[PDB]
Amino acid sequence: SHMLRPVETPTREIKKLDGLWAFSLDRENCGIDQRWWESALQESRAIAVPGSFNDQFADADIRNYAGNVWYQREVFIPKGWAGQRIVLRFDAVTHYGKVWVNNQEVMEHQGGYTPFEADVTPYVIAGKSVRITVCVNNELNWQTIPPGMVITDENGKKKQSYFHDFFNYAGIHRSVMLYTTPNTWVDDITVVTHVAQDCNHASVDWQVVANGDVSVELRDADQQVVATGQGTSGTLQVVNPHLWQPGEGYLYELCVTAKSQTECDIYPLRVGIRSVAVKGEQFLINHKPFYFTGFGRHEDADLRGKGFDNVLMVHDHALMDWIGANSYRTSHYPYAEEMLDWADEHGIVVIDETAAVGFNLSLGIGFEAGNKPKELYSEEAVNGETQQAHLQAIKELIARDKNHPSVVMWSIANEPDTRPQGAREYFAPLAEATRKLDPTRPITCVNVMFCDAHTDTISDLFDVLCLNRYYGWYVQSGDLETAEKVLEKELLAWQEKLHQPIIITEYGVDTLAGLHSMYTDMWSEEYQCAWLDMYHRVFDRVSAVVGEQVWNFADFATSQGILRVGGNKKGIFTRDRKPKSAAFLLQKRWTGMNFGEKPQQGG
Amino acid sequence: SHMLRPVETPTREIKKLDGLWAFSLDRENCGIDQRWWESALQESRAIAVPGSFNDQFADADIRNYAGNVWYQREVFIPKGWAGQRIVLRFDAVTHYGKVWVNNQEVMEHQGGYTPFEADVTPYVIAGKSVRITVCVNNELNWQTIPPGMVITDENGKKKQSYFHDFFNYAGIHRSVMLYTTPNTWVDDITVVTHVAQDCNHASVDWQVVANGDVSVELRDADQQVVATGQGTSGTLQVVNPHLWQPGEGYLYELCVTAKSQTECDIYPLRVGIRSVAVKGEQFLINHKPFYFTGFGRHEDADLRGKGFDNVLMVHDHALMDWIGANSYRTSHYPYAEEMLDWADEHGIVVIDETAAVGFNLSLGIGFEAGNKPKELYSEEAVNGETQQAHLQAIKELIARDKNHPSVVMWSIANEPDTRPQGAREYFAPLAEATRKLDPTRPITCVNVMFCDAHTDTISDLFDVLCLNRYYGWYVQSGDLETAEKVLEKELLAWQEKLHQPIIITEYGVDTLAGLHSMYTDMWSEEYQCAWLDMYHRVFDRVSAVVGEQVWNFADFATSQGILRVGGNKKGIFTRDRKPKSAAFLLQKRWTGMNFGEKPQQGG
Ligand SMILES: Cc1ccc2[nH]c(=O)c(CN(CCO)C(=O)Nc3ccccc3F)cc2c1
């Protein structure tokens, strides 16, 4: 369906992200049989909502819970919403959630990171109080988008196992909200920006009205009409542009309007006039070679898990600003739009990624049998339905983010095993579909290291080569000398094989804050510096390398294991955002370069 | 003035705590002169708002900034607030704030932990947007509630000095909002709940209205009318009840109804049926010998400072609950109301405290530079204005929390130096006025240790004896063997002198998380455990001691100094809420007792 971020013009939001809701588990899964959405959640406890439910209660049982949980709260409908289209919207409900407005089911959704909404007008009376019950499921299987395997022992007690690194946090991670629109209302927009060697060109507009005549107009930062248009679906505006630039991110405003014989609708969409294209080994932005620096990030912090927070966001962007990072990838799932809005406004360049991580049965900490399917691409494991769900995930992401200028490329997935035979058969259609859905952005699929230049089967189907490389860590452990020979050899292989622009989208080493060593070995702050330093020497020798995104700006939680010391420690910053010495290393290299430009080969 | 916690039926809130305001510093203090509230803040940046401005940007020059900062924001006013009361309310603006609606100065407030509000109807138009500018000041001087001394050096820059331990966080710490009201509006309510010997008794209701007849109806949790009152002036509803007990905390809902011939105003007030008093050497909640357990706390956390957070609140309470804490103190300032709303609902007992802290001038080892007034109570320093401002502080807090059943006691001040001359003539009037503001709750002043039995001039004026003691820490450094003698010798010296209930409001020791020592010495977890043990042993032998609160629940930030290792480390939990070995020690002692019941000497 159509998706537009709610703003407040003839429209209005009652946030209802207002924190406190009632909360209780369903350990027996009799919540639907007993119709819990019909009565006050019995035996419930307070919970904060935008957030993960796992960490809020310092309870291991609640944290490791698999299955259904229930949220609930009563809210008032603004009396002034008398005759309006009243919509209930969840910016995210991790993995699955079903919604009842007082014994009337309105929604159902299967993906944890994108919004779903429903017209609740016929089920809400303006000025009264309603009972909103959400049932949330945090289970993964071979058709869910991060694939997964829910294991159930002889006792019936379920247990979630997955193939990605980060912890499987669940719950309502983002805002829920009631919002208003007139019965004639803009409900879908699509803007393509074009540019021709930086003096003028056009923005195609494509508008889906909920039954109205649409007019449109483009406004400066100082709010003046620089262009104007009429008609529905089709338009091309022409300009003398202030281009959206990685540095500043100048934004115009396209004000879309929907007119009945009786009702108006005004929707302002921030627009960034910029071109994103690949030419050979280069990633051109506004027809200029751009060099990515920054992080693979995560949505993760103490207490709130993947729950959104404005302070966290403000702080992290201050940090990424200080350190000199010009980019990042929404590591492994669509991030909260607030992030993309920030990126739009501050000129931050983003690699937007689906939640499609886990395709791989070969990332294992060995020697626990842990029978996984023997065929990755097979009816048991990654099958036709999976491909659909995957396709669906791509659709829902693009539908949401197609208009963000900050997004400079789509990432279909992260580290699938591309060796097995069905790999190319599974991904080819997804690469073609993605291009259909958005023709205006280069496409990528993040590559795991054991599917190297000689064994990978998929990378030619994409535009930019995004590599996850750990030479000197998981392999050639603690050996910088040989890791460097391999890294550079593998990069040159990829260069000559595909002649695409290479971005190292992951490189980093677990590092204990405060672990110092004269011998500069693996888990020490000094090693993290020596490692990163070595990678950088290599990158500056390889012309096709067009980007470097360190594996993790900050330590994050993972599933328990012998590889993970209370989580992943590849953070440049700790989880409470305190900088390891590598932070200062990067700030020198990144602030030291000419902005958005690859280093001549040496200082 | 009149303060009511906004709730939602004939009233509606659009929370302006939509994080992301415009923010800037005014290092030239020329914003007021240049009328910054008239246009958009130039040289601004996004800031999340609830929460301190200090830490959001990982910047020292902003963290330590003293002077004025500016918050700005725009907000559409709801169409449905057609001809209604529109009230702009800030739950807190640390220290000072001046507010402008577009160009209209609508507000001004000194005090940082209590709300203020005003009617903005004439300056706002429903259906339109309005610009909101807030000038926030963090400066502290002698006539301020947290007293202090700002020193402008030869250069044009200010540098704040103060006398309390915790860091001087500032900014908009709590919810800000627009909330609506009919023109006939309840604007004040006061409730006193008398009980006697636990079979039955009534509640006086007394309230102020904007011209409306009041239908006062008391309700079950089940919404059944268990009593009814009549008349805009008060009542006595004498029925047999369900007591608000510390264990579970039952709650009645007294609905207050104001009426005009044209408009009707409904307001639900949470009412906890309980009595509180001092009887000899006992604290009697519902006529029961109680025993306080818990912490002295602080509004403090990573990144956000003293800014409120639902997750943080949900988690901390999960901890206190788990560890066995049945009570705590709003240490050194009025906390956000949510904390008390939560305490009411969960039967959490709460010693409410004013921001009166810093009244003392001998409070450290200063190696550093002379002049700091000579006479604490003197026109130089703590004087007429300062007793006024102090009174004003007692007023506002009580005007807000007089109806919170969790509040079982008022704390006038913290660690005042009561040896100088004016000490007794200063606190006597305030001690008198407080009871005159609320005679339903006992009152205390938290005592510093160098005012001890033979030297404190001011304890007799209060009902309960609250003592901060570090006998094994600041003095008798690391000698549990003598620290015991002194402590008991001291406690028994207090008992015989005043014959009041004794609560140790502060007892704890700095402890580096992860510092272990076979020698069980200072700043080691082992020591912290041994120290707290030693105290418990002494409490267990003084029949007068009715309450124990460990020093801080969690490590927090302080001003820079030799005694503060990256902040006060006296937390039982670290700042990110990870427990020190003392947590499990307290766990066993606290949950191990009978609820609200002192051990039988020993145990
Ligand atoms: C050349 C080669 C061959 C085999 C490999 N196998 C691996 O597992 C990994 C680690 N992998 C990171 C991959 O980039 C990870 O994320 N691991 C993980 C997570 C949860 C449980 C157990 C786990 F090992 C690297 C790897 C490299």
Ligand SMILES: Cc1ccc2[nH]c(=O)c(CN(CCO)C(=O)Nc3ccccc3F)cc2c1
């Ligand atoms: C018997 C005696 C005599 C003199 C003393 N002087 C002190 O300072 C303290 C410490 N005090 C806690 C009081 O309970 C504190 O809060 N200190 C502080 C804070 C910031 C900077 C420097 C600082 F010393 C105790 C104390 C005891």
